[PDB]
Design a protein around this ligand. Structure first.
Ligand SMILES: Nc1ncnc2c1ncn2[C@@H]1O[C@H](COP(=O)(O)OP(=O)(O)O)[C@@H](O)[C@H]1O
Ligand SMILES: Nc1ncnc2c1ncn2[C@@H]1O[C@H](COP(=O)(O)OP(=O)(O)O)[C@@H](O)[C@H]1O
Ligand SMILES: Nc1ncnc2c1ncn2[C@@H]1O[C@H](COP(=O)(O)OP(=O)(O)O)[C@@H](O)[C@H]1O
Ligand SMILES: Nc1ncnc2c1ncn2[C@@H]1O[C@H](COP(=O)(O)OP(=O)(O)O)[C@@H](O)[C@H]1O
Ligand SMILES: Nc1ncnc2c1ncn2[C@@H]1O[C@H](COP(=O)(O)OP(=O)(O)O)[C@@H](O)[C@H]1O
Ligand SMILES: Nc1ncnc2c1ncn2[C@@H]1O[C@H](COP(=O)(O)OP(=O)(O)O)[C@@H](O)[C@H]1O
Ligand SMILES: [Mg+2]
Ligand SMILES: [Mg+2]
Ligand SMILES: [Mg+2]
Lengths: 150, 150, 150, 150, 150, 150
């Protein structure tokens, strides 16, 4: 619509590296509205339900261990085309091949340490949102700048 | 002392102007650790307890009315002297009198729209953390860059 | 040549969003020289002469109404390949498909609210320049850093 | 008071060092509104009236000679206490004595090359706006983020 | 490996333009470790050995004259895929065709004045490193953040 | 006076936290010229001479032990009043008491981890430059933006 939402998670590395404010600000600058925000230490269950599509990927184990190893900053951003757009702002999986100006392109080197998670579709955003936030955690009242939308 | 915590709140005006990342980043850069973080629309009750000291003052009402009017991003940072330091980083009540480089100095013009709330003392930080955050919402084991403290 | 000029206009949204300084600075950083600069509220005539190529596009009406709805910051930048280069710095029409690091890519979401106008050719730059600035408004004396040009 | 205006001038040195965006952005960020903006090479006459208070001083000549030597970016910002605030944001006469975070503190080293001019009072701002700007060059209806003032 | 190194040189222009801190910081942000750093005025011999592959290119003479015309900030950065990655962060030869967010894309206009040199392969990095630094100038002790590498 | 020089050292903590570019940039922006720059792991002997004034103090040992523990980025900047100015830009001994906008104010929390060393006087700058730098490592002919000094 224009009320599309995405699930973004600043991974433990990213939190550790003090990149939280920097990530949020990129999205705030873009004109996306923060409709949900929290810091938590993901549980094994959440992590596994989160990355369930990767269940049989050789890095799963490590992935799940790492995401649960420290605080994660989870958030939901709402705005027109926010899913595909947050995905672009992030870069690609490998932070080395990520274009400069992208979050990963500017701050990571290693795949295992690629700082942020972003939902890759409306479907998965919807699913991840529900997984990480209770609807009472999410705003109903959205108001970005009127200067953003026609 | 390295464990000291402060209660910081990005007010509805800070949130609508898109200064959340920007603010977190400042504290992140300073070396303070994020032990608690969430976005919520405060409650008249929270709002009133939170501003209890000002109940006999003329702006009390506006204060409470304002705070409850939109999303707030509440957070607690931990670190050596964080209470006094975050105050200095914020500026003074009046943004116009607040020095450039401070949060208020840099982004605010009006007292009732001074973007952020910072605990003014350990006692108050302690009271305010409790008030706004559930124990399970705060990190227990905090890991700050080891380059920060001796 | 190397004395090529382009017409850039920070649209009402962009002005409203306080992105003026930020846009200028990108161009100053790049090494382009500001040879003309002003803030004005475009008239219907200017707007229509400006976007005349779009006269029969379904959004014309809206375009013209919006550009005239508030202050515009018009400017001319001079430098080698400034037209094509300012165009790259801007992104594409849709700020959503605009690469991160581009003005539109970093700050817009909506096409109707894509913050800046940049001439798309030497021809059109020449025409827009003449349309928006009297030659007395334009510098004759250009001096970028000697550190920029061989 | 919310309507108060100040006269700011980015001097020839500020302009050549590419600090125009950078400076506008600071004021933009503060929440001040841009009611007047233009680039011009000052006139000896303008220059002298503008610096009239210093005509009996030794540096008067240099001052006028300097100001008239290249492009200046003149602007008027409106907002509550903007005159005093923009002064604070600028620093003191001597850049070296100006605190980090201020314009002079951050970018200047020498008094005769102190980048910017800011009106020191309402009377002076009023005199200087008139002097440098044509009434039709200033906005009449100013719209500041509504998140700025109570 | 992950201990790969690259030779980066901030050219005289770039030094002149005060872009040194800005370049370094991009690399520090990325997570690369500075294992060697110095400011020197390259000699004709160094310059020619450096750009030996270009010996018969029409710009060689000019290239060599320019690199020797002022201080160069030479440095070595270590990290996974640092060669290809530093090359991406730089842009392409022509700063005009360089993507926004890239060093050249953000700061240059002219090919002759494209601010930085980056080795283009492991081979050439190895060779340039040895050419510009004595092994006593290079760290042996590498420690980037553990937050960077899996 | 325009020729004045200062000794600045980015300490092992400044270096590990990736604040080298960030720090150089500040000084670069101010208009100070980089006359000497290198990365080295200090020597107990250097370290002790350098901190000679504090040999009768309790933290002397820690100081020397700390300094020698990792890479330091030593640099000398030249410019009018640079000694006093760079001090102001650094903050006070205690980062927590250092004002926002200053280096310590912005990035440090602890006295023993206060990121940078700046010469406190001409005599000391002169002594410290000599100590840390070889004459041939310092520029002889310094060219500062001509927009900086009158
Ligand atoms: N080859 C790998 N080795 C280690 N971790 C990996 C690898 N591939 C992916 N990952 C991790 O798995 C996460 C999920 O993988 P993927 O869906 O492919 O990435 P993305 O986050 O780009 O969508 C990545 O962000 C990263 O944290
Ligand atoms: N006189 C006033 N008028 C309007 N709002 C006020 C006034 N005094 C305080 N406030 C508001 O209420 C808050 C009250 O806290 P106070 O202790 O006075 O300030 P601070 O936040 O700097 O500690 C202020 O930050 C501001 O939002
Ligand atoms: N489909 C659209 N809906 C609304 N506004 C549009 C649309 N397409 C273009 N615009 C507006 O018209 C301006 C001119 O259009 P166009 O030439 O295609 O864009 P550009 O500014 O990228 O060159 C755009 O910048 C935008 O402000
Ligand atoms: N003693 C001086 N030497 C050189 N230039 C000076 C001197 N005093 C003032 N100036 C210059 O003229 C301006 C005069 O205005 P003044 O009221 O003294 O300072 P300010 O701009 O801070 O209000 C200064 O900003 C500076 O450019
Ligand atoms: N056509 C040219 N005119 C002038 N200088 C050039 C030209 N092509 C290259 N250079 C200079 O030669 C350097 C080496 O050239 P090249 O290997 O092609 O560039 P790069 O630095 O992108 O690898 C460039 O960075 C630039 O400083
Ligand atoms: N009381 C202390 N405890 C720990 N470290 C200290 C103490 N006093 C000084 N230092 C350390 O040694 C340096 C000594 O220099 P000093 O003259 O006291 O400070 P400054 O660096 O601000 O000039 C400090 O910057 C800091 O790293
Ligand atoms: Mg994926
Ligand atoms: Mg077009
Ligand atoms: Mg090459």
């Amino acid at each position: 619509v224009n009320k599309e939402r995405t699930f973004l998670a600043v991974k433990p590395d990213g939190v550790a590296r003090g990149l939280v404010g920097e990530i949020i600000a990129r999205y705030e600058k873009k004109g996306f509205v923060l409709v949900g925000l929290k810091q938590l230490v993901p549980t094994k269950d959440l992590a596994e339900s989160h990355y369930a599509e990767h269940k049989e990927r050789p890095f799963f184990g490590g992935l799940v261990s790492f995401i649960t190893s420290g605080p994660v900053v989870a958030m939901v951003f709402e705005g027109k085309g926010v899913v595909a757009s947050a995905r672009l702002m992030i870069g690609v999986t490998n932070p080395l091949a990520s274009a400069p100006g992208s979050i990963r392109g500017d701050f990571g080197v290693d795949v295992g340490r690629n700082i942020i998670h972003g939902s890759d579709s409306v479907e998965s955003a919807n699913r991840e949102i529900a997984l990480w936030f209770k609807p009472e955690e999410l705003l109903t009242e959205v108001k970005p700048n009127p200067n953003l939308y026609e």
